[PDB]
Design a protein around this ligand. Structure first.
Ligand SMILES: *Cc1c(COP(=O)(O)O)cnc(C)c1O
Ligand SMILES: *Cc1c(COP(=O)(O)O)cnc(C)c1O
Lengths: 399, 399
């Protein structure tokens, strides 16, 4: 009998995680990693936060069981997540209109929402920005949903093309899902202004879209509360919305897989009915979520002293990135770039669209050992005072 | 516009996890939990193994980063898993015919296999024992696979109905998946003998089935090596197979979600091609797996001292369950049961199929505070010297 696996064709590499694999294999001592979106400190390490180490020490000495969590995970994790998203006294919370499931990462939260929608509703289509995180298409396609692209980035002026965005989204019908990044747009670093958010919120209700927010970077743009303003403007207006959030980056907890999928409906009875189906989709996927990372997050947010430490550590990460954006721009001019790179200062979060071509990015890797994503997305949080000079000399050499 | 969530139908409660919720809500003193398949110790607690605490201490002191694992997880975890399943000197390992992905629990391994098969092969149908773990059907159905049932249990003789099993698999075609429990069948506790496994292995290769093994209880029947004899009979004869394994129960690591999906193909080049697509299916689901639980397992399995502790702790658990089996039978007799429950002593693992009707299980819950799954499955590992007599009086009362 001819084997079931004989005719399988190999998958292409992941544009982000395959780049990381090349980086590990590169033998050259001076290689620079500006690929995957993780935070590096000044010394070029990816450290464990001090708030996290303290919480893990508490867990080690006080955990008495590894008994299964419920399908939706740790209750306090869910409540603390809703408060971070919608605010201490939100009406969504007091009206019991939101339910949260702890998930394995923000990716897990996106797939759970996708599965939930495809199996329980009439949704067929998800609208994603052009460009976006590459894995968005793969998540939604694997759940059986069609993916459509709306306009976003103006590459000539390095800005949000708000007119193009609104014209492209006039083709999105009622009952379609539209995906927004909450803040720190991946890959462009360009977010809407509050006014623009408010314009989209009203347009969204008028046209009957189902908004889905991907919130992987809360706290890296301006602050925990400030970064949620766009989401809260939507939440004041809509009867239904979905939030897939991640704690991978703002807690430095990447490999423990800590995220949430939050469901909002018109009233408490509807959201409970809908959440029963979300729990079924989870049970048929990974059954119930991993405890260690979520327990760390809930321990930190629940304890005023740890939370104080964590917010300061997050502030330090946000400010180190802003210092590198400035240093990057200044050093490019010193190293002989005659192009204006000022737009990089106006971008938020870890990433900037460098403007480099695929051929230039390929040269940076092969000839200079500098690793960026083929779209020209560069991880500013991968820049340090020590690698800035070689990094900028390499960029000027390929311009 | 009308709400997207309004036409949603509520999902029923999970037959196992809903029971556990009912048990938590019950305020009657003396209630007894014989539902979900976790190990309880002699005091009715669900403890953390000593080997696990020691391993977690080492991780706390020595971890310097939470940087993302690769899509397929910790490499040493995969190699140690293959040795456990196939034996230290297996030809499968020497010929590099197997690849292992670390997954979030045994459920996550099953789902990853289902998504991989549905998208990359012409597999359309999965055959599962009747009865089986109720979540099997949900997992494969979530990928759009048809699930059929084969005969398994002789409810009259409390034995494997091997003749009916053979006859009911007559219509399973070449390229169909046939699912086998590796040991400690859930829910019946009845496993094939070695000769029966050898007969099934021959039949499987003649009919061209793709075998898929669900190994959630390795070490709870007779021992770690003995419990894998049936898998290893299949492995000696098949070019291709899939193994979904769990460390939830044999490490008491339930809520850390530690499992593995192992792919076996004819040769190294084929399994690597196939495994590239299994990685693509993981990336579109939860991206990469949770580190803490698998790090514990890998640390214990890699260190001779910790491993000898763990193997003794697993022996202790296995032996406690076997003593409860014998105590359960003796105490039913002392409390006046006329039905013969001797078959309980012949069954393996945590569960016995008691033979109680749905009506009798409901009476036990409502009238006596005794919680079993509605199929009559009772968790013997939830019985203690302290709750044995009240439990047995309750059962006798409903017979
Ligand atoms: C990192 C990221 C994710 C995935 O988060 P994980 O917690 O690693 O699964 C999802 N969306 C965006 C935009 C991201 O940047
Ligand atoms: C417990 C169990 C599973 C699920 O294992 P997890 O690691 O908890 O996801 C799968 N199959 C069987 C037969 C089980 O008993």
């Amino acid at each position: 009998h001819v084997g079931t696996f004989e005719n399988i064709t190999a998958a292409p590499a992941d544009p982000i995680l395959g780049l990381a694999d090349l980086f590990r294999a590169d033998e050259r001592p001076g290689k620079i990693n500006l690929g995957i979106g993780v935070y590096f400190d000044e010394t070029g390490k990816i450290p464990v936060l001090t708030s996290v180490k303290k919480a893990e020490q508490y867990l080690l000495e006080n955990e008495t069981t590894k008994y299964y969590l419920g399908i939706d995970g740790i209750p306090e994790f869910g409540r603390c997540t809703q408060e971070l998203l919608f605010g201490k006294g939100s009406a969504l919370i007091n009206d019991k209109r939101a339910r949260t499931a702890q998930t394995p990462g923000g990716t897990g939260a996106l797939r759970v929402a996708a599965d939930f929608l495809a199996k329980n509703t009439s949704v067929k289509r998800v609208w994603v920005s052009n460009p976006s995180w590459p894995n968005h298409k793969s998540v939604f396609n694997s759940a059986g949903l069609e993916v459509r692209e709306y306009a976003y980035y103006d590459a000539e002026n390095h800005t949000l093309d708000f007119d193009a965005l609104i014209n492209s989204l006039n083709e999105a019908q009622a009952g379609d899902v539209v995906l927004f990044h909450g803040c720190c747009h991946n890959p462009t670093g360009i977010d809407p202004t509050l006014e623009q958010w408010q314009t989209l919120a009203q347009l969204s209700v008028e046209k009957g879209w189902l908004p889905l927010f991907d919130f992987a970077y809360q706290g890296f743009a301006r602050g925990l509360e400030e970064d949620a303003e766009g989401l809260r403007a939507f939440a004041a207006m809509h009867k239904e919305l979905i939030v897939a959030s991640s704690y991978s980056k703002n807690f430095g907890l990447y490999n423990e897989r800590v995220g949430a999928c939050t469901l909002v409906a018109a009233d408490s009875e509807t959201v409970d009915r809908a959440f029963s189906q979300m729990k079924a989709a989870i049970r048929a996927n990974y059954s119930n979520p991993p405890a260690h990372g979520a327990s760390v997050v809930a321990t930190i947010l629940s304890n005023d002293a740890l939370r104080a430490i964590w917010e300061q550590e997050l502030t330090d990460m946000r400010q180190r990135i802003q210092r590198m954006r400035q240093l990057f721009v200044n050093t490019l001019q010193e190293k002989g770039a005659n192009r204006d790179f000022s737009f990089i200062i106006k971008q938020n979060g870890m990433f900037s669209f460098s403007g480099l071509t695929k051929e230039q990015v390929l040269r940076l890797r092969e000839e200079f050992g500098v690793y960026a994503v083929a779209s020209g997305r560069v991880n500013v949080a991968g820049m340090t005072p020590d690698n800035m000079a070689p990094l900028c000399e390499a960029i000027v050499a390929v311009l």
